[PDB]
Amino acid sequence: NGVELSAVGVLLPVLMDSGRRISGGAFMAVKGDLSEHIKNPKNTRIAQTVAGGTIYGLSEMVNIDEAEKLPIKGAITVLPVVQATATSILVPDNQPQLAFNSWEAAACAADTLESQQTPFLMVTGAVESGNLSPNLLAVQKQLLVAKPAGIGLAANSDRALKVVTLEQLRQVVGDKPWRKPMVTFSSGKNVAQA
Ligand SMILES: [Cl-]
């Protein structure tokens, strides 16, 4: 069970531990307030940012202080997705708890996305003072999410499409046409580490 929504935003890879195997999935930092589609009662924390923005879909396992320093001016909801196209997503009813801060580069890029289409590119990394932090898990996100889904990944890492500043990330998400109609991802019920 899930809901298909018209939506524009920026995809981000997540990893999930089921004690035996690490698997991969995706969330999207979606533009707008979509908090009515949050179905995990742990992901019920909201971050209001210094720039006037509001981010929904967060849990206690996210560093909220770092989320509140993001240069996001509008509403962003981070939702799990099992399918995405240029203009829609499919949000599963079974939703994992979102943890950590690697969704921030996508949420910043989704906030200043002016194109009206989601870029065909996934983005990972935490944001601190207009820069992407150094990356830890791009290689594992490549292996478990982006490469099997057939889509590029941007990260502060030379094993991704490399971006260091929020300004560079904005340029890179601006022109990413869809090389196929849809990407799909596995879902999990286990904590999603973004
Ligand atoms: Cl370099």
Automatic annotation (TrEMBL):
<comment type="function">
    <text>The precursor of VP2 plays an important role in capsid assembly. First, pre-VP2 and VP2 oligomers assemble to form a procapsid. Then, the pre-VP2 intermediates may be processed into VP2 proteins by proteolytic cleavage mediated by VP4 to obtain the mature virion. The final capsid is composed of pentamers and hexamers but VP2 has a natural tendency to assemble into all-pentameric structures. Therefore pre-VP2 may be required to allow formation of the hexameric structures.</text>
</comment>
<feature type="active site" description="Nucleophile">
    <location>
        <position position="102"/>
    </location>
</feature>
<feature type="domain" description="Peptidase S50">
    <location>
        <begin position="1"/>
        <end position="194"/>
    </location>
</feature>
<comment type="subunit">
    <text>Homodimer. Interacts (via C-terminus) with VP1 in the cytoplasm. Interacts with VP2.</text>
</comment>
<protein>
    <recommendedName>
        <fullName>Structural polyprotein</fullName>
    </recommendedName>
</protein>
<comment type="function">
    <text>Protease VP4 is a serine protease that cleaves the polyprotein into its final products. Pre-VP2 is first partially cleaved, and may be completely processed by VP4 upon capsid maturation.</text>
</comment>
<feature type="active site">
    <location>
        <position position="141"/>
    </location>
</feature>
